Amino acid sequence: SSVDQKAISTIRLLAVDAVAAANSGHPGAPLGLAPAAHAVFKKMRFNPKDTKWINRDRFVLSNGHACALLYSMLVLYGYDLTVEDLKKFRQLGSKTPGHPENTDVPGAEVTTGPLGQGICNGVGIALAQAQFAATYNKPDFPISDSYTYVFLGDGCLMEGVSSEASSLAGHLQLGNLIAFWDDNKISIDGSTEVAFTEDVIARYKSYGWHIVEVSDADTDITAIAAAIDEAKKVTNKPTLVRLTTTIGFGSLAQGTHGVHGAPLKADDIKQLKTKWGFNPEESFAVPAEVTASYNEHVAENQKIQQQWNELFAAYKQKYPELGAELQRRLDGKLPENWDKALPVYTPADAAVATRKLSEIVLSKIIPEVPEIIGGSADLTPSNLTKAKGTVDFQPAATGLGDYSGRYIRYGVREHAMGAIMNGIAAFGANYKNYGGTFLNFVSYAAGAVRLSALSEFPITWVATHDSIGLGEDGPTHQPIETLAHFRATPNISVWRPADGNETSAAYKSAIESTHTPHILALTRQNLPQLEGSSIEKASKGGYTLVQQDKADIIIVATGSEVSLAVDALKVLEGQGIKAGVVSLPDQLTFDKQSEEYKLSVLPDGVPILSVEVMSTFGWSKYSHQQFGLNRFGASGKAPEIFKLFEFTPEGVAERAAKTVAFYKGKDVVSPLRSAF
Amino acid sequence: SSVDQKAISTIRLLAVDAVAAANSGHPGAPLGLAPAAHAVFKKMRFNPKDTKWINRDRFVLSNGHACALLYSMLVLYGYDLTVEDLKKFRQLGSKTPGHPENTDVPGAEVTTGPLGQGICNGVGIALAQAQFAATYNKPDFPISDSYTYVFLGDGCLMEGVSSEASSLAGHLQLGNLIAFWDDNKISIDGSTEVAFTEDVIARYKSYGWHIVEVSDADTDITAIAAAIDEAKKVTNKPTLVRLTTTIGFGSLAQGTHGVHGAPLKADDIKQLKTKWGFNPEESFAVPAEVTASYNEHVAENQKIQQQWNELFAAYKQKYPELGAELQRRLDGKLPENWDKALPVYTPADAAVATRKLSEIVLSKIIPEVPEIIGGSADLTPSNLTKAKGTVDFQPAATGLGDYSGRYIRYGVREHAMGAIMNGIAAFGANYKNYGGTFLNFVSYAAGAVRLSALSEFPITWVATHDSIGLGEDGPTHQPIETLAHFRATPNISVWRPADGNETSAAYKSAIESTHTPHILALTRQNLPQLEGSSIEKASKGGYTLVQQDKADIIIVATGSEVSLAVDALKVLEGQGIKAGVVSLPDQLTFDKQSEEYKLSVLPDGVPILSVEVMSTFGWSKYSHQQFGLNRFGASGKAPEIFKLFEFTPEGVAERAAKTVAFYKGKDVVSPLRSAF
Ligand SMILES: Cc1ncc(C[n+]2csc(CCOP(=O)(O)OP(=O)(O)O)c2C)c(N)n1
Ligand SMILES: Cc1ncc(C[n+]2csc(CCOP(=O)(O)OP(=O)(O)O)c2C)c(N)n1
Ligand SMILES: O=C(CO)[C@@H](O)[C@H](O)[C@H](O)[C@H](O)COP(=O)(O)O
Ligand SMILES: O=C(CO)[C@@H](O)[C@H](O)[C@H](O)[C@H](O)COP(=O)(O)O
Ligand SMILES: [Ca+2]
Ligand SMILES: [Ca+2]
């Protein structure tokens, strides 16, 4: 009460002092949201000493620039983050980076800062919670009953990705999602009147959300707590709580854009402290009564988790099969020998498009690995991402699925699908989740994909129609730059399998992943089964498909161009040129192999030509010369497009012959060599 | 009447026959939207023989997969597109590609197919029209009074980019925008009930749009025409017309997802023809009464344009200064010697961040070039994109600006900003428009940026905070992959100027552009004025900044790393190594120079090391070894991040020395050489 007010002041002043010490960062939203943070964390169930308790409530700061607020809460509650870490806010190597990162910050569920992402991550956490609860809960066994609390600002509400995810969350009736809009009428460019005058509340009602409005969120923590209680009674709608706040509340500069994103003036900090009963000569004060009050809540939460552990033990007795499955998932382990379900092919099998091979893999592994769920952005019958016989993830009230379903209809929402996948991964419980679209439209989701990599989440894009091989839809659909973009992003495995065995290797990697997102670039068109491919060899990312001791040239290729390279080898033989072929289904996986393995694939002393029907960027890592497509495509029958751009056996052979000639009398060393 | 019905049938059957001949494409939405297309084009003012008449109404097919409908309208109205072109729908090299492309299709204002883009392009066309009208119209001189008509589907309404643009368009009170939702309750994955159950109409009202609902848009062309008349009376709101249609109307498979995206069965086409009075044995029928009726409307429109030409002549008499400016703009010519306003610097001038240099350029050229308008995605005081003293583009009713304003508050809406910029460029009248955000968040707009390149639109991104040099905001804000992504996209000039003179060259290129979008990657941090830079040399895209005959190594760098390379040259001199320095402010501009010019910059016989604090992808085009940053960044003071990653004079010198050693006794040829 008095202690509640002191806690709020403590939070506010820790945040302002952290910004002040860094002389960098964002004091405004922390000042405005400290009452709400105090109220929400008092309602949340969490263990600072076990950040991975699966039935914890989750908190996401979607307005991630406000992270001094989050860090202050985590410090006050005794997470593995201290006042000394706050004093190192925004400093190189600290645990308090300028935007929250789940890899570095204990209690940061996701990485935010790029606006709009966190609320979508919250949708995914809530989606996973609903699916998890439907899969495991039993009468008298509420294994999963947690909530997902999200703070977001005007910036997040302006980013289209949040509209996508909010439309979908309302459709999915996600009643355990409770989001709070920091309604402070200020963004970087000033008043929201200059660019953001829509009726946000009316829009959220149009999505099927419940609304609670708190008119004085600067002080009315009673109403904020009551809004949470109200939201919990509305079990079939996500709730948006409108928190009408003053940005920078208490500052001389409150209610202005100047308090958004720069440190307060020293005299402003002094009057903040004196107004709230603190010592203006002191920084980073933590009144012991605040610590005590917060510790009481932690102790209660720890007793809740202790009881949850006993509930889980009793669950394993009453439901031994589900209990063992749940234990395995919480231990982060896939089913024993699950990969024996992966399809295997021989060169005698028929040609198949890698999108169809992907369908077949999914159909075999989904029944074996319950923690696989996924969907498509309105391309299910084109991406081939649904296993026959599975049920869609939908609220049962719709009649269209159930929360125990495993297939998500994302609609035409690639960016939100990407960020929702990140939230599903962030939920934990070993979820291995995927999302289908055309490769060219993965680009719509770049904001989220990049965060999958930075956050180290094992999400998977099923990215079909990978090239000019899709044909008639034409250049607005045909990737050119796309693989280069994602390969140039740290920590993305970009698999472009050539055939059945390679597609199984790509899935083995994607599903086994624990820290690396995957993009599977798959074909519309049929490709032959290759002589020399296997799951084992393709699992190395790059391998020698056709070994030619005494090669005059090695052709390195991916996907649809491996078969082309093999056909070019035969043309070259007729010209008296001996070629080897390397298949490079994943450059990242290949890069992580030993130097000796990599040199066995790309040796010294032989010219290497790359062939891939998109950008040549990156390919000089593996080749001396590069045959690619650095112009936009065309609308026509796919074989005619390939002929137009000379991606034919003869066109490849011609460039291979020119490569052999270009290096005659030169000393050639592997592209893997470098000066540093 | 009877002729109206025959026209609608003609449109429907041309579209279905085009799909049938290609055995590829999308018959459903063309069948459903033919009544609306017929009605809208009858209300539109356009000249098939002058696609660039500046006061034409514009039409945008945002659901671009429905382009057989658009092509049928263009053929029937006598644009430079014939039945023979329709017979070549989706065929290599035809003028009827599988999605409309403004470069290839007469009467296609923009390139659509990637969902959500076209409606945003329409917002930009309407924005430009409003700004253009406010700038030039005078009493009795309605130089510009045209409308922007957009067709869009459920897919476009699900893509977040359309929410961004619709929020902004409602805020901007764009009363000459009239959009039509194809409300057919079907997408690729089936019924919209599976993923898209929001109250679209309520959402559009929340943005401040006017609504008209047409309950039977399969037949009620009277109500569609009346909806247009109603929309035109609402001058301070964009209008959404809900067209309740049956996808594939008339087909045996109408009302199903199967009619969305594959050819109809032959017997289905036969019964379509017989039901509508056509010969089932005939394809591509064009009844002469339809041609006649459409020609009447063209003739009336041509008389309207003829009168507009006389109005323009009278305008030039009454308002000679504005008239000459308008003529110049319609001739596609910038003001004579406008570039004399570009700022010029010497090495004696102070260090300045290239974001601040950009502000100064804009402040000098905006007063000289009226066709420059632009804005920022809620980063105006950080991107520095507004010239002091200019007025924002806002409806005057808000009191916050005027439609004659030149500065757009886009809000936190990068993707819509990108697509709106494309629409402003598509309007014509020599508009040279720009949009500011942080470089890392240009990625949120990749869907639109790619279309800027494919559409050949001279738009400009003012992309500040380009690297780890931004410091404390950390890795969620620091570009790594971003330049590689856009450089790998065909037809994007990616300028990364090092200093004042280079920044002026970058703007000279961006503003003179007529077919190439520009991204200007600009710094937060200060950089020195370079000895050896000039507008003239930087205008070549790459140039020798420090010439060293007898160089042991050449260091090629961009942006902030050019000064670093110059400092490394001094360290190397102390180690007995002579270096030259190349500055490469735009790789695309450089690539377009003559081979002899390029070789004068990157000669044979000398190792070349690239230095740029982001991905090394692409750099092997210009260098033998590459020093870059292929991992994510860090949150800290920027100079400490540079030190951590060894982007220091000593760290560059060390790698340069290792490069010299690596090539000792090797024959080195320019990276510009290739085997083919
Ligand atoms: C995708 C993206 N675009 C731009 C930014 C730059 N940026 C950070 S905060 C911010 C404005 C935030 O306004 P709001 O969310 O209302 O925060 P508040 O001012 O209330 O603290 C912007 C534009 C960003 N972080 N992410
Ligand atoms: C950004 C983007 N994502 C995905 C696609 C793939 N695609 C084309 S049409 C379409 C569905 C369109 O549904 P709707 O707009 O309702 O069209 P209709 O079925 O009514 O013809 C999809 C998902 C695309 N063209 N663009
Ligand atoms: O327009 C689009 C996607 O941009 C879709 O309809 C796309 O054209 C699909 O290829 C068609 O629906 C046909 O699908 P598929 O034969 O490629 O599986
Ligand atoms: O959080 C964000 C952007 O992601 C913004 O507030 C960003 O941090 C800006 O850098 C701050 O507002 C400070 O701006 P500036 O000093 O870099 O111009
Ligand atoms: Ca705000
Ligand atoms: Ca539809």
A400 vs A475: CA distance, rounded Å? 36
Concatenating the DSSP letter of every residue in B283-308 gives -S---HHHHHHHHHHHHHHHHHHHHH
HEC secondary structure over B364-423: HHCCCCCCEEEEECCCHHHHHCCCCCCCEECCHHHCCCECCCCEEECCCCHHHHHHHHHH
Q: A110 CA to chain B: closest CA distance, Å?
A: 12
Q: Are A460 and A510 in contact (CB under 8 A)?
A: yes
Q: Which residues pair with A518 in a beta bridge?
A: A460, A493
Are residues B345 and B451 located together in one domain of the fold?
yes
Q: How far apart are CA B615 and CA A615, in angstroms?
A: 15
Structural domains counted in chain B: 3
Q: Which two tokens stand for residue A479?
A: 């990737």
| Under 8 Å between Cβ of A501 and A562 | no
The b-or-e profile of B374-404 (16+ CB within 10 A means b, else e) is: bbbbbbbbbbbbbbeebebbbbeeeebbbbb
Tokens 């994510």 map to which residue? B632
Do β-strands B518-521 and B460-464 pair in parallel, antiparallel, or remain unpaired?
parallel
Nearest bound ligand to CA A384?
3
Strand order in the sheet with B493-495: B407-409, B372-376, B432-438, B460-464, B518-521, B493-495
**By alpha-carbon position, which residue is closest to atom 16 of ligand 4?**
B382
Q: Residues B55, B6: one domain?
A: yes
Cβ A474–B206 below 8 Å, yes or no? no
| Test the A interface: residue of B164, B420, B485 with most A CBs within 10 Å | B485
CB A165 within 8 A of CB A413: yes
CA closest to B382 among chain A residues? A188
Distance CA B114, CA B106 (A): 19
Interchain CB distance below 8 Å, A379 and B188: yes
The structure tokens listed for B483 are: 């330049």
Question: What ligand is nearest to the CA atom of residue B412?
Answer: 1
Please give the Cα distance from B561 to B467 (Å, whole number).
11
**Cα–Cα distance, A433 to A335 (Å, whole number):** 16
How far apart, in whole angstroms, are the C-alpha atoms of residue B10 and residue B282? 12
* Locus of tokens 């959009």: B179
Tell me the backbone φ, ψ of residue B170, rounded to 5 degrees.
Answer: -65, -45
Picking from B657, B353, B323, B341, the residue whose alpha carbon sits closest to that of residue B523 is: B353
Quote the minimal CA–CA distance from B411 to chain A in Å. Answer: 5
Segment (H or E) for B507: helix B500-512
CA nearest B32: which of B153, B119, B140? B153
User: Which amino acid is present at A221?
Assistant: I
Spacing of C-alpha A53 from chain mean position: 21
Residues A566 and A509 in one domain: no
| Pocket-testing residue among A356, A382, A444, ligand 3, by greatest number of atoms within 8 A of Cβ | A382
Q: Find the CATH number of the domain harbouring A589.
A: 3.40.50.920
Known binding residues of B: 26, 65, 113-115, 154-155, 184, 186, 260, 355, 382, 414, 441, 465, 473, 524
Length of chain B: 676
Residue of B127, B391, B444 to mutate, interface with A, max A Cβ within 10 Å: B444
Q: Which residues in chain A (401-440) have CB-CB distances under 8 A to chain B?
A: 409-413, 415-416, 440
The packing angle between helices B67-76 and B2-22, to 10°, is 120
Judged by a CB distance cut-off of 8 A, whether residue A382 touches chain B is yes
Cα–Cα distance between B413 and B164 in angstroms, integer? Answer: 6
> Which residue's structure tokens are 């645990």?
A95
Side chain identity, residue A92: L
* Host H or E run for residue B448: helix B446-455
Where is A42: in which H helix or E strand? helix A28-43
Query: What gap in Å lies between CA B78 and CA B88, rounded to an integer?
Result: 17
What are the residues facing B495 on neighbouring strands? Answer: B520, B586
Name the region of A456 (left: φ>0; alpha: ψ -120 to 50; beta: rest): left
Question: Final residue of a domain: which of A298, A327, A356?
Answer: A327
Q: Which of B99, B117, B120, B187 to mutate to test the pocket of ligand 2 (most atoms within 8 A of CB)?
A: B187
The answer to whether A458 faces chain B, any CB pair under 8 Å, is no
* Identity of the residue in B196, B443, B658 whose CB atom sits nearest the CB atom of A446: B443
Distance of CA A118 to the CA centre of its chain: 11
| Residues A97 and A113: beta-carbon distance below 8 Å | no
CB B196 within 8 Å of CB B162: no
Whether B50 and B177 share a structural domain: yes
Ligand 3 atom closest to the Cα of residue A476 is 4
Q: CB–CB of B488 and A477 under 8 A?
A: no
Query: Do the beta carbons of residue B373 and residue B407 sit within 8 Å?
Result: yes
Using an 8 Å Cβ cutoff, are B427 and B129 in contact?
yes
- Among candidate residues B277, B304, B327, the one where a domain is terminated: B327
Judge contact between A239 and A267, C-beta under 8 A.
no
- Find the helix or strand (DSSP H, E) in which B270 lies: helix B266-275
Tell whether B26 is within 8 A of chain A (Cβ). no
Sheet holding B543-546, edge to edge: B543-546, B579-583, B553-557, B608-611, B625-627
At residue A564, what is the residue type? L
Q: Which atom of ligand 4 is nearest to the CA of B381?
A: 18
Q: Please state, in angstroms and rounded to a whole number, the distance separating the CA atoms of residues A558 and B298.
A: 52
Given ligand 3 and candidates B23, B24, B65, which is best to mutate, with the most ligand atoms within 8 Å of its CB? B65
B640 catalytic residue (yes or no): no
The first and second tokens of residue A177, run together, are: 């999602």
Q: Quote the ligand 5 centre to A208 CA distance (angstroms).
A: 23
Say yes or no: CB of residue B295 within 6 Å of ligand 4: no
3-state helix, strand, coil in chain A (%, to 5): 45, 15, 40
Coil vs helix vs strand at B582: strand
Give A141's DSSP letter. Answer: B
Torsion, Cα of B535, B540, B546, B551 (10° steps): 180
* Any atom of ligand 4 within 6 Å of the Cβ of B477: yes
A530-546 as b/e: b if 16+ CB within 10 A:
bebbbbebbbbbbbbbb
**Sequence letter at residue A147:** Y
Site of tokens 């060894």: B646
Q: Which residues of A106-119 are buried (b: 16+ CB within 10 A; e: fewer)?
A: ebbbbbbbbbbbbb
Residue appearing with tokens 């029958």: A637
- Report residue B548 as tokens: 């060293």
SS3 labels along B110-157: CCCCCCCHHHHHHHHHHHHHHHHHHHHCECCECCCCCCEEEEECHHHH
Going from the Cα of A93 to the center of ligand 4, the distance in angstroms, rounded, reads 20
Token pair 């309208």: residue:
B73
* A579-583 sheet: strands from edge to edge: A543-546, A579-583, A553-557, A608-611, A625-627
B85 vs A: CB within 8 A: no
User: Could you tell me if A493 and A546 lie in one domain?
Assistant: no
Amino acid at A409: R
A129 is written with which tokens? 């919670």
Shared-domain flag, residues A529 and A601 = no
Same domain as A669, residue A578? yes
**Tokens representing A617?**
């960027």
Interface with A, mutate which of B158, B181, B417, B577 (most A CBs under 10 A): B158
For residues B155 and B113, what is the distance between their CA atoms, to the nearest angstrom?
11
Longest CA–CA span in chain B (Å) reads 90
Which listed residue (A164, A414, A502, A561) is catalytic? A414
Task: Ligand 2: list residues with CB < 6 Å.
Answer: A 378-379, 412, 441, 444; B 28-29, 63, 65, 113-115, 153-156, 159, 182, 184, 186-188, 247, 260
Within 8 A by CB and 6+ apart from B13, the residues are: B269, B272, B273, B276, B278, B285
**What residues 64-83 of chain A have any CB closer than 8 A to a CB of chain B?**
64
Q: What SS3 class is residue A188?
A: coil
- Tokens read off for B527: 């950089």
Q: Tell me how close the Cα of B159 comes to any Cα of chain A, in angstroms.
A: 5
Q: CB of B292 within 8 A of CB of B39?
A: no
Judge contact between A392 and A380, C-beta under 8 A: no
Distance between CA atoms of B299 and B524, rounded to whole angstroms?
Answer: 56
- Furthest-apart CA atoms within chain A: distance in Å: 90
Cβ contact A409–B91 (<8 Å): no
Pick from B170, B106, B179: nearest CA to B147: B179
- The structure tokens 């130089």 sit at B143
Cα–Cα distance, A307 to A141 (Å, whole number): 12
CA angle (B188, B191, B192) in 5-degree steps: 90
Which tokens sit at B163? 């929410």
Q: Are A218 and A246 in contact (CB under 8 A)?
A: yes
Residues A509 and A383 in one domain: yes
* Same domain, yes or no: B445 and B489: yes
10 Å Cβ neighbour count for A604? 12
Taking a C-beta distance cutoff of 8 angstroms, is the pair A270, A280 a contact? yes
Q: Which of B471, B482, B540, B495 is nearest to B357 (CA)?
A: B495
In total, chain A counts a number of residues equal to 676
| Dihedral (Cα; B549, B555, B556, B561), 10-degree rounding | -130
Provide, as residue numbers in chain A, all residues whose Cβ is less than 8 Å from the Cβ of B93: 634, 636
Please indicate, yes or no, whether residues B323 and B406 belong to a single structural domain of this protein: no
Residues B482 and B613 in one domain: no
Reduced to 3 states (helix: H, G, I; strand: E, B; else coil), residue B485 is: helix
Which is nearest to B99 in space by CA: A614, A472, A480, A640?
Answer: A472
The DSSP output letter for B263 is P
| Phi (first) and psi of residue B485, to 5 degrees | -55, -55
A666 touches B at CB < 8 Å: yes
How far is it, in rounded angstroms, from Cα A53 to Cα A42? 17
- Give the range of the structural domain holding residue B332, as residue numbers without chain letter: 328-539
Task: Give the tokens for residue A630.
Answer: 């650095």
Burial class (CB in 10 A: 0-12, 13-18, 19+), A398: middle
- Of B510, B539, B568, which residue is a domain's last? B539
- For residue A379, which residues of chain B lie inside 8 Å, CB to CB? 188-189
Question: d(Cα B440, Cα A461) in Å, to the nearest integer?
Answer: 21
Tell me how far apart the terminal alpha carbons of chain A are, to the nearest angstrom: 62
Q: Catalytic one among B101, B414, B561, B612?
A: B414
Question: Token digits for B381?
Answer: 């005081």
- CATH number, domain of B440, equals 3.40.50.970
- Which residues of B fall within a CB distance of 8 Å from A94? 635-636
Rounded Cα distance, B354 and B470, in Å:
12
Would you say the CB of residue B82 lies under 6 angstroms from ligand 4? no
Same domain for A500 and A364: yes
DSSP-based three-state secondary structure for A393: strand
B382 in contact with ligand 4, CB cutoff 6 A: yes
Contacts of B208 in chain A (CB under 8 A): 197-198
Give the CA distances from residue B267 to residues B33, B195, B270, in Å, rounded to whole numbers and listed in that order: 22, 33, 5
Contact A497, A590 (CB under 8 A): no
Please state, in angstroms and as integers, the Cα–Cα distance from residue B206 to each residue in B123, B199, B239, following that order.
Answer: 17, 11, 12
User: Nearest residue CA, atom 1 of ligand 3?
Assistant: B65
CB atoms within 10 A of CB B528: 17
User: A545 to each of A502, A555, A559, A605, how far by Cα in Å?
Assistant: 11, 10, 13, 19
Radius of gyration in angstroms for the set of CA atoms belonging to chain B, rounded to a whole number? 28
CA B257, B260, B265, B267 torsion: positive or negative?
positive
In angstroms, rounded to a whole number, what is the distance separating the alpha carbons of residues A323 and B612? 53
Asked if A207 lies within 8 A of B203 by C-beta distance, the reply is yes
Burial of B435 (0-12, 13-18, 19+ CB in 10 A): buried
Helix axes A354-365, A500-512, angle to 10 degrees: 50
Q: Pick the residue whose CA is nearest to atom 17 on ligand 4.
A: B382
Give the residue carrying structure tokens 């009428």.
Answer: A185
Q: Which of A103, A122, A118, A121 is nearest to A51 (CA)?
A: A103
DSSP A500-550: HHHHHHHHHHHHH-SS--EEEE--SSEEPPPTT--HHHHTTSSEEEE--TT
